[PDB]
Amino acid sequence: LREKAKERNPDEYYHAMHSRKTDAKGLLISSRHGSLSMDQVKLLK
Amino acid sequence: RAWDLIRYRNFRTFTGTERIQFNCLAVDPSGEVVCAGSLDNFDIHVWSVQTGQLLDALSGHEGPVSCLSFSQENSVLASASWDKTIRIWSIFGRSQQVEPIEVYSDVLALSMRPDGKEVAVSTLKGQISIFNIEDAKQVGNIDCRKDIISGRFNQDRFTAKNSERSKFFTTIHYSFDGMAIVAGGNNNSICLYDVPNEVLLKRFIVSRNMALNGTLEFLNSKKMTEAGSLDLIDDAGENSDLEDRIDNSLPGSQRGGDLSTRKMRPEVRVTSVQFSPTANAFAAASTEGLLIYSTNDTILFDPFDLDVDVTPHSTVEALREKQFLNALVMAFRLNEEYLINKVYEAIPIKEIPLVASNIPAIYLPRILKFIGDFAIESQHIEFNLIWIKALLSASGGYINEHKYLFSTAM
Amino acid sequence: AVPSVQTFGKKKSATAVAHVKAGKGLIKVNGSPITLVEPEILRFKVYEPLLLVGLDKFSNIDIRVRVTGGGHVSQVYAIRQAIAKGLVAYHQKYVDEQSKNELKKAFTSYDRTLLIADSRRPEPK
Amino acid sequence: SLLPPTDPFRRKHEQLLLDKLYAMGVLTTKSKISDLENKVTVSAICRRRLPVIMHRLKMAETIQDAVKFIEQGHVRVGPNLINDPAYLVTRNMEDYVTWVDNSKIKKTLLRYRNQIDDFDF
Amino acid sequence: DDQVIGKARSRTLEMRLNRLSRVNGHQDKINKLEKVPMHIRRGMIDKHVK
Amino acid sequence: MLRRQARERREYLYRKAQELQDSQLQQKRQIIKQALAQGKPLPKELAEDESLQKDFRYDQSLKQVDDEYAATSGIMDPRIIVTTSRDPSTRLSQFAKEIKLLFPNAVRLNRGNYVMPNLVDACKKSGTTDLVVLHEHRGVPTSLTISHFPHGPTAQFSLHNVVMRHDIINAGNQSEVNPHLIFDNFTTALGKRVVCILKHLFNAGPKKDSERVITFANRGDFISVRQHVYVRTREGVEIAEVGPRFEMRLFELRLGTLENKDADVEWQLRRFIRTANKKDYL
Amino acid sequence: YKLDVLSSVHFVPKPASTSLEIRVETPTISMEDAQPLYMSNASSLAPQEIYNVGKAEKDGEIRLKNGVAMSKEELTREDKNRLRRALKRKRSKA
RNA sequence: CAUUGGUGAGCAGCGAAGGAUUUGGUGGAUUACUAGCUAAUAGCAAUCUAUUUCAAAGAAUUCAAACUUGGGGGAAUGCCUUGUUGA
RNA sequence: UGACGGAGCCAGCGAGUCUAACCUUGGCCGAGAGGUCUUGGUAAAAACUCCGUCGUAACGAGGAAUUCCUAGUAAGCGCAAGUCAUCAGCUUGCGUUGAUUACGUCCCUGCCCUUCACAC
Ligand SMILES: [Mg+2]
Ligand SMILES: [Mg+2]
Ligand SMILES: [Mg+2]
């Protein structure tokens, strides 16, 4: 893992970067299950 | 390679031990040390002119060295790289010192003040930043991205406005007075800026030839079709002669080969620019050739310190009354070449020493400029030499105090 | 979307992230007003940008600075660098470039470290 | 090869050709002279084209994607923007392949890691 | 060996290597006739025999 | 730089792995060359390998110092920095100066708060060739590590029986000529590797009448390091110790700079294996 | 040539070598291009090249690079020894 | 407590017979404006072609002609060259 | 250029189911082995900023000589780890605060080197 970190290319681009997000600390955030619109909420309520 | 012009001999040749390609060069004012840089070494090689030995290799840059220049007075060396930094080397002296200065982006060109007190650098951001060498602090900045005119290529799939191909100046040079910078790059513009006030004095369009690829910002939509641009279609097969039909183009070549090799239209670009040491002119090397812009014609009316009393008629009245000094001064205030010439030739030889000693200091640079331009092609060798002798003897000390104001005239 | 810009200031281990947006003149550091920055003796240091360009420019923006790492002094320098860079970047993106040039000129004339990082990288001799 | 094996001329030129081709990147190794026949191929030259080197440097997910980004003016080599997808990059010049400063792709790279500094852009 | 150049060198080296290989290499593997169509090879053999 | 250095290491590492694969091929070509010269039959594997025989025509015209040092061996004089551990004692500072005088092209640098990655990066920028870092225990030098730039190797030693020149009264000043070198009793491949590392710290081409000699004498893996000044007499040679005395024992050798703790180890000392005492590796 | 153009002239320079050139004395004007002008009028060989004061033709004579010539007869003995010693040092360097 | 996360419910403010977003088609520019056709010193433009044919001129032993081929090895039968046999 | 107390607040290294005292007084159970409880003694971020109080035998900052040292350097402060040699009477890392003075000279002391144009 350390070698992978050292050899990382700063200019590597993947289309999935738009969907994936990173925390303030710098770590990847992963959704536990993978928001509700009001019309959906009204039915559920 | 060092060339001796009097006998046209390559009297010496320098080469690195690792056989590096050299892209920039700088020569000491004393002509005793030569430094060169490369785009694949990151070091600055130094040679001794008399011996040809490699004195030393300067290290410290973390990127390729893009340019070099020696200070004409202080004899320091200023180098810039794509390392986003500038380093001032004090190679001469018992102790070697290096002073790095950080810059916001990659440095593409560098110009040294004739005084040797400041250095200007053109960055990849389209900025010209001036630094004080002794204090190593920025003293000015000129924004140039907006001024640069860049054209859309026929092969480009993106607009010229969004194009980031060349919005920077790859070459810059000071005026010898030290108040102007002329800049050029891989673009259709040559921009002339004023340093102390950081404004664009003028912009020059390098070319208006639609044969060159980068001339136009907007391309005619009629050329575009469902296939693509009509220009990109190769019509070589239509040519009648075989030699024209033959295609010797290599697939990926960009530069350094014959035009037949490239397969793409020539691109309008300025490789270098410089000011004339002896005249108010500058020369720009470009694809079509070496364009020379000069102020020789001087049709403009640019008076200095006129009054109502000053008139071309009044000057002639002064000559007829034998008031030579007043006639000459009033001619300069009008700043008319023909009137200056008329008064200049009408002053008798006996009165030259009296007039020369009494010319105001403000007009002294103007007379010296006129004599130099006039004398080079005039037939009055002796008359001009008498004037120069009178002026130098009368105001020799003043010219010494202000060398850079009088540099081009001298 | 609300126009916003992000910038970083750095000094030794101290790193400050400044977020500058359209607003009503709300400057905060680590969730508290800038006036509470410590140590008090160096407080005017972090005031230096605000005073050099004048508080009028900040009346139309909100700045939020989050600082981590380093000590007190390096944190102060990170804050001031981040604030200056954020103001310049915001005026670049969402205001005329003339004001950008004036801001850069003022900051560079006073102290270039406000914009460019002061990095004392070792130099062997 | 048809020159005598101990010829100084033969050894000099063969090493020079091996030296040059390795520098271009066409040849992976300089050890074996037989490589000039067996391992000199069009694929070796094509493998040094800009789109392929972007793919190996992971600047693009596919060679087709790399070609599109070049055609769209996102890629520079050194300080020069290159929109020609046939540019051959030597081993030395592979260090300077990178995105253009104002590229939208660069913003996504820095925005994803929350390391975007708008002063630079 | 140092003087000989050209096709003579290439044909000389191949003959030597074949001679050494014949001792230990299997007859089928060491020598293989180059693939040629029948109508050509039978024509080549016929003319050579003549 | 950083991109250039990284790629150069990968190409260097890739070249090695291919060379190990090519070693069998090289031996096969040697068998063919011997058979052609002697005329003996080829082995069965070589006899049926048509590809190798065809390749042999091109590979017939094919023909030392270690690969890291080969490029600059005898061309560029070394540039050396001698440093210490953080907050060094006075004795270690004195000893670091003595090591600086030992090597003609050494410069002593103060390590106050310098970080190891920063130190190696700074030295690599300036073109430094080797870095020497010294450790101590209560003012007694204990270890000495030599890191060769830009990509190693890093050799670590442990110093015993150190006798500094500061302990000598009225010793005087050293001579700083380029010295002659003596490497005695280095036989194994590791011994040759150590000799190559130590030899390149010195300038190439000492004067024949140079009056300073530095000797590294191997005695049971304990390399005795001595410095002497000699005068050629009419019936022999007379020498005199200049110091310092110390014995250095190698205990690690990695293929990388001293910063990289993850560098692949070329050789290490196995002290707890049951047959440790019996064999001397150097 | 083809490979250099293919690589956009980012090749690695060839190893350096030394070769000899013959320069023939001629007026400097000839070396220039053909136009109604000339830039320099000197000769293509410098005065040193045309004549270098070298070893004496006569054995009894001693001649130096500075142009001073001394016959062995006129030299005093102390000067002969001095010149002989100077000869030894020059030879030793070479 | 913070969202510079989504989806909604509403104000202040702006605010002249409504406002906002997206999109198909055509026209004019994107190089500096001397008119259409033909068998063209003039006809035609509603064409003639029921004078449109004759005369004159016009044919390099260049009688040469792949400057156009991915590399290595051959080429039975082809093709090129050279000689040769019998008419 | 103090001590005591309170308050505010700023790091970077570091993560093996692995991390860790000693000696006694006695209850109970148990064939024993031992198990559990009880009992006394011994050993074992800081700087920084703000506020309040007091108050200025040996030794009181270390002689002669001698050594080292040029920028994130000297010096101060603390926190981690103990990585096959060395180290715990300690060693190595990590961050924090951060200067004065020189950056010239061969005068003294040592070491060293020398005796293809144009112009000299
Ligand atoms: Mg210290
Ligand atoms: Mg400590
Ligand atoms: Mg210590």
Short mmCIF file of C-alpha atoms in Angstrom, two decimals, chain B residues 103-372:
data_model
loop_
_atom_site.label_atom_id
_atom_site.label_comp_id
_atom_site.label_asym_id
_atom_site.label_seq_id
_atom_site.Cartn_x
_atom_site.Cartn_y
_atom_site.Cartn_z
CA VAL B 103 7.16 32.52 -9.04
CA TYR B 104 3.52 31.53 -9.41
CA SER B 105 4.00 29.56 -12.64
CA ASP B 106 6.53 28.22 -15.13
CA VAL B 107 8.96 30.84 -16.42
CA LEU B 108 9.23 30.91 -20.22
CA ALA B 109 11.42 33.97 -20.88
CA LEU B 110 13.73 36.33 -19.01
CA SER B 111 15.12 39.79 -19.76
CA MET B 112 17.84 41.62 -17.85
CA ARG B 113 17.83 45.36 -17.25
CA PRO B 114 20.75 47.22 -18.88
CA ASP B 115 21.41 48.69 -15.43
CA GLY B 116 21.61 45.14 -14.11
CA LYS B 117 19.36 46.02 -11.16
CA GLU B 118 16.10 44.32 -12.19
CA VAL B 119 15.00 41.25 -14.15
CA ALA B 120 11.68 40.61 -15.90
CA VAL B 121 10.22 37.15 -16.48
CA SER B 122 7.33 35.97 -18.64
CA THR B 123 5.36 33.15 -17.00
CA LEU B 124 2.97 30.55 -18.35
CA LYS B 125 0.10 32.46 -16.71
CA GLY B 126 0.56 35.31 -19.20
CA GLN B 127 2.27 37.54 -16.64
CA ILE B 128 5.40 39.70 -16.84
CA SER B 129 6.81 40.14 -13.33
CA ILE B 130 9.75 42.44 -12.56
CA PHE B 131 11.99 41.63 -9.60
CA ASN B 132 14.74 43.59 -7.85
CA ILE B 133 17.91 41.51 -8.07
CA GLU B 134 19.71 42.94 -5.03
CA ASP B 135 16.63 42.82 -2.78
CA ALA B 136 15.02 39.77 -4.47
CA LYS B 137 11.53 41.27 -4.11
CA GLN B 138 8.89 41.89 -6.75
CA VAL B 139 8.57 45.49 -7.92
CA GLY B 140 5.97 45.20 -10.70
CA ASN B 141 3.60 42.94 -12.57
CA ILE B 142 1.97 43.23 -15.99
CA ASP B 143 -1.05 41.15 -16.97
CA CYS B 144 -0.87 39.97 -20.58
CA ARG B 145 -3.37 37.11 -21.04
CA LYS B 146 -6.07 39.48 -22.28
CA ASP B 147 -3.79 41.36 -24.69
CA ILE B 148 -2.56 38.24 -26.50
CA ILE B 149 -4.38 37.53 -29.77
CA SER B 150 -4.50 33.79 -30.50
CA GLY B 151 -6.22 32.30 -33.54
CA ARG B 152 -8.24 29.12 -33.95
CA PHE B 153 -6.49 26.49 -36.05
CA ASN B 154 -8.31 24.68 -38.83
CA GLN B 155 -7.71 21.40 -37.00
CA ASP B 156 -8.86 22.70 -33.60
CA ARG B 157 -12.11 21.33 -32.18
CA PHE B 158 -12.29 24.08 -29.53
CA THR B 159 -12.80 27.84 -29.67
CA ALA B 160 -9.93 30.31 -29.60
CA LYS B 161 -11.35 31.99 -26.49
CA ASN B 162 -11.34 28.71 -24.55
CA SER B 163 -8.07 27.68 -26.20
CA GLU B 164 -5.14 27.69 -23.77
CA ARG B 165 -2.66 26.92 -26.55
CA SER B 166 -0.61 30.12 -26.28
CA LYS B 167 -1.73 32.88 -23.92
CA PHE B 168 1.84 33.51 -22.70
CA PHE B 169 4.96 35.22 -24.04
CA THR B 170 7.87 32.91 -24.82
CA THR B 171 10.30 35.79 -25.48
CA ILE B 172 10.73 39.27 -23.98
CA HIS B 173 13.30 42.05 -24.26
CA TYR B 174 13.91 45.41 -22.59
CA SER B 175 14.39 48.66 -24.41
CA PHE B 176 17.90 49.98 -23.93
CA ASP B 177 16.57 53.02 -22.08
CA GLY B 178 14.95 50.60 -19.63
CA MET B 179 11.33 51.79 -19.82
CA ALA B 180 9.73 49.37 -22.31
CA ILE B 181 9.35 45.63 -22.87
CA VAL B 182 8.62 44.01 -26.24
CA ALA B 183 7.11 40.53 -25.98
CA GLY B 184 6.16 37.77 -28.38
CA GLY B 185 5.16 34.14 -28.42
CA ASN B 186 3.40 31.38 -30.32
CA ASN B 187 0.60 33.82 -31.12
CA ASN B 188 -0.42 36.40 -33.72
CA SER B 189 0.50 39.39 -31.52
CA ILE B 190 3.61 41.36 -30.58
CA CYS B 191 2.86 43.48 -27.52
CA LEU B 192 4.93 46.48 -26.43
CA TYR B 193 4.49 47.38 -22.75
CA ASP B 194 5.74 50.26 -20.62
CA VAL B 195 7.42 48.98 -17.47
CA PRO B 196 7.11 51.81 -14.90
CA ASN B 197 3.38 52.27 -15.54
CA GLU B 198 2.56 48.67 -16.57
CA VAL B 199 0.39 49.58 -19.58
CA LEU B 200 0.27 48.31 -23.15
CA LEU B 201 1.79 50.98 -25.40
CA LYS B 202 0.78 49.15 -28.58
CA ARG B 203 -0.02 45.74 -30.06
CA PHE B 204 1.15 44.53 -33.48
CA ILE B 205 -0.48 41.83 -35.59
CA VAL B 206 2.32 39.55 -36.76
CA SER B 207 0.56 38.23 -39.88
CA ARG B 208 -2.66 38.52 -41.86
CA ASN B 209 -1.99 35.50 -44.09
CA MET B 210 -4.76 32.91 -44.13
CA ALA B 211 -2.16 30.40 -45.32
CA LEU B 212 -0.69 30.44 -41.81
CA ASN B 213 -2.76 28.39 -39.41
CA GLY B 214 -3.09 30.67 -36.38
CA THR B 215 -4.06 33.95 -38.05
CA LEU B 216 -7.84 33.96 -37.51
CA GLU B 217 -9.76 33.89 -34.24
CA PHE B 218 -12.98 32.86 -36.04
CA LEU B 219 -13.13 30.54 -39.05
CA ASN B 220 -15.73 30.70 -41.81
CA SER B 221 -18.58 28.31 -41.08
CA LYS B 222 -19.05 27.67 -44.81
CA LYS B 223 -15.84 25.63 -44.79
CA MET B 224 -17.26 23.30 -42.15
CA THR B 225 -19.23 20.36 -43.52
CA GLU B 226 -20.54 17.01 -42.31
CA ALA B 227 -17.13 15.53 -43.12
CA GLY B 228 -15.23 18.38 -41.48
CA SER B 229 -13.26 21.43 -42.52
CA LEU B 230 -12.86 21.80 -46.27
CA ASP B 231 -9.28 22.96 -45.69
CA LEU B 232 -8.25 19.74 -43.95
CA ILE B 233 -8.97 17.76 -47.12
CA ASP B 234 -5.68 17.01 -48.87
CA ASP B 235 -5.73 18.01 -52.55
CA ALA B 236 -2.24 16.71 -53.35
CA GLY B 237 -3.60 14.00 -55.65
CA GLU B 238 -5.06 16.63 -57.96
CA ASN B 239 -1.59 18.04 -58.70
CA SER B 240 -0.28 17.10 -62.14
CA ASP B 241 3.39 16.62 -61.27
CA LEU B 242 4.45 13.49 -59.39
CA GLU B 243 6.81 15.33 -57.03
CA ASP B 244 3.90 17.39 -55.72
CA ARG B 245 1.76 14.28 -55.23
CA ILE B 246 4.42 12.44 -53.20
CA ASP B 247 3.76 12.56 -49.45
CA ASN B 248 6.92 12.22 -47.36
CA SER B 249 5.23 13.30 -44.12
CA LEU B 250 6.04 11.37 -40.98
CA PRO B 251 2.94 10.63 -38.86
CA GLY B 252 3.75 12.48 -35.63
CA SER B 253 6.46 15.05 -36.39
CA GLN B 254 5.84 18.54 -34.99
CA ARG B 255 9.09 20.44 -35.45
CA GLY B 256 12.65 20.25 -36.72
CA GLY B 257 11.95 18.86 -40.19
CA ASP B 258 11.18 20.17 -43.65
CA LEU B 259 7.72 21.57 -44.34
CA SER B 260 6.84 18.49 -46.40
CA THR B 261 7.40 16.40 -43.27
CA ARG B 262 4.91 18.21 -41.02
CA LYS B 263 1.70 17.64 -43.09
CA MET B 264 0.09 20.59 -41.24
CA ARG B 265 -0.05 24.25 -42.15
CA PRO B 266 2.68 26.53 -40.74
CA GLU B 267 1.70 28.22 -37.48
CA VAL B 268 2.15 31.96 -36.98
CA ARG B 269 4.61 32.39 -34.11
CA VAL B 270 7.38 34.72 -32.96
CA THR B 271 10.56 32.93 -31.89
CA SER B 272 12.56 35.95 -30.68
CA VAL B 273 12.34 39.73 -30.36
CA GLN B 274 14.96 42.41 -29.75
CA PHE B 275 15.40 46.18 -29.77
CA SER B 276 17.87 47.86 -32.09
CA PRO B 277 20.96 49.04 -30.16
CA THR B 278 21.35 52.12 -32.38
CA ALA B 279 17.80 53.03 -33.48
CA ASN B 280 14.21 53.16 -32.26
CA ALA B 281 13.33 49.85 -33.89
CA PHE B 282 12.81 46.21 -32.97
CA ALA B 283 13.07 42.99 -34.97
CA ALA B 284 10.87 39.92 -34.46
CA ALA B 285 11.77 36.53 -35.91
CA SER B 286 8.65 34.74 -37.16
CA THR B 287 7.66 32.00 -39.59
CA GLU B 288 7.42 34.22 -42.67
CA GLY B 289 10.67 35.96 -41.76
CA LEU B 290 12.41 38.58 -39.65
CA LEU B 291 9.94 41.47 -39.34
CA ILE B 292 11.59 44.82 -38.54
CA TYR B 293 9.46 47.64 -37.12
CA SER B 294 11.03 51.11 -37.02
CA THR B 295 10.05 54.70 -36.25
CA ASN B 296 12.21 56.07 -39.08
CA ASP B 297 9.51 57.84 -41.12
CA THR B 298 8.43 60.20 -38.30
CA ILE B 299 5.41 61.75 -40.01
CA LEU B 300 3.74 62.28 -36.63
CA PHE B 301 3.57 65.74 -35.05
CA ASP B 302 4.84 65.20 -31.49
CA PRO B 303 5.72 68.67 -30.18
CA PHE B 304 7.58 69.21 -26.92
CA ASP B 305 6.95 72.35 -24.85
CA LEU B 306 5.38 74.57 -27.50
CA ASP B 307 4.11 78.09 -26.98
CA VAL B 308 2.06 80.38 -29.19
CA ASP B 309 5.24 82.24 -30.20
CA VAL B 310 6.87 79.08 -31.61
CA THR B 311 6.12 78.61 -35.32
CA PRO B 312 8.01 77.40 -38.41
CA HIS B 313 7.93 80.98 -39.68
CA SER B 314 9.38 82.30 -36.42
CA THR B 315 12.33 79.89 -36.55
CA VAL B 316 13.31 81.12 -40.02
CA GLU B 317 13.06 84.69 -38.74
CA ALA B 318 15.55 83.80 -36.00
CA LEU B 319 17.97 82.39 -38.57
CA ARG B 320 17.82 85.55 -40.69
CA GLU B 321 18.46 87.59 -37.53
CA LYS B 322 21.41 85.25 -36.75
CA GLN B 323 19.92 84.01 -33.45
CA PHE B 324 21.18 80.48 -33.94
CA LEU B 325 20.61 79.10 -30.44
CA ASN B 326 17.02 80.34 -30.29
CA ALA B 327 16.38 79.09 -33.83
CA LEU B 328 17.71 75.64 -32.94
CA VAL B 329 15.78 75.41 -29.67
CA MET B 330 12.51 76.51 -31.29
CA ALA B 331 13.08 73.87 -33.97
CA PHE B 332 13.40 71.18 -31.29
CA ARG B 333 10.26 72.40 -29.53
CA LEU B 334 8.43 71.89 -32.82
CA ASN B 335 10.42 68.65 -33.28
CA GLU B 336 10.20 68.85 -37.08
CA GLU B 337 12.94 66.92 -38.87
CA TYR B 338 13.07 69.28 -41.84
CA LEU B 339 13.19 72.35 -39.59
CA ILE B 340 15.91 70.79 -37.43
CA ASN B 341 17.88 69.98 -40.59
CA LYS B 342 17.43 73.51 -41.92
CA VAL B 343 18.68 75.11 -38.70
CA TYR B 344 21.40 72.48 -38.25
CA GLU B 345 23.04 73.22 -41.61
CA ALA B 346 22.60 77.01 -41.35
CA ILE B 347 24.75 77.42 -38.21
CA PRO B 348 28.23 78.63 -39.27
CA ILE B 349 31.28 76.71 -38.11
CA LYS B 350 32.52 79.56 -35.92
CA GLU B 351 29.24 79.56 -33.96
CA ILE B 352 29.07 75.79 -33.37
CA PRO B 353 31.09 75.78 -30.09
CA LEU B 354 28.99 78.65 -28.72
CA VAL B 355 25.69 76.96 -29.60
CA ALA B 356 26.73 73.51 -28.38
CA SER B 357 27.76 74.78 -24.95
CA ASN B 358 24.44 76.64 -24.56
CA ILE B 359 21.93 73.97 -25.64
CA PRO B 360 19.59 73.12 -22.72
CA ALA B 361 20.17 69.73 -21.12
CA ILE B 362 16.60 68.66 -21.95
CA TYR B 363 17.21 68.88 -25.71
CA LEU B 364 20.67 67.28 -25.56
CA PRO B 365 19.39 63.70 -26.13
CA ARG B 366 17.37 64.93 -29.12
CA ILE B 367 20.26 66.59 -30.98
CA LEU B 368 22.48 63.55 -30.44
CA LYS B 369 19.78 61.27 -31.88
CA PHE B 370 19.37 63.50 -34.94
CA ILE B 371 23.11 63.70 -35.65
CA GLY B 372 23.54 59.93 -35.49
#
